[PDB]
């Protein structure tokens, strides 16, 4: 009976989720955490990472 | 400066190196251009310059 309110909820806490899901991606490069990035590589390429 | 054969990439922006570090030191957004030769015709003795 309520489905479209709840759908409303449903959609917008699914979206934080996503955006929250996407700072674990690598986007193509070796890792999703900038402090390893930092760590591990020099400037030059850390800037591109 | 003079340098070492191997250390003539060390001369470079954020490079990790002995002279990189402690000698000379690049910054990240350095523009402009190394010129490097070699000099064992005058910068050597057989002696140990």
Redesign the interface.
């Known amino acids: 009976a309520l489905g479209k309110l709840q759908d409303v909820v449903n959609h917008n806490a699914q979206a934080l989720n996503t955006l929250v899901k996407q700072l674990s991606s690598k986007f193509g490069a070796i890792s999703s955490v900038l402090n390893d990035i930092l760590s591990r590589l020099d400037p030059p390429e850390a800037e591109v990472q | 400066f003079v340098i070492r054969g191997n250390e003539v990439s060390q001369i470079?922006?954020?490079?990790?190196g002995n002279i990189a570090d402690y000698n000379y030191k690049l910054p990240?957004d350095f523009t402009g251009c190394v010129i490097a030769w070699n000099s064992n015709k005058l910068d050597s003795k057989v002696g140990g310059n």
């Open positions: 470079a922006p954020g490079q990790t990240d």
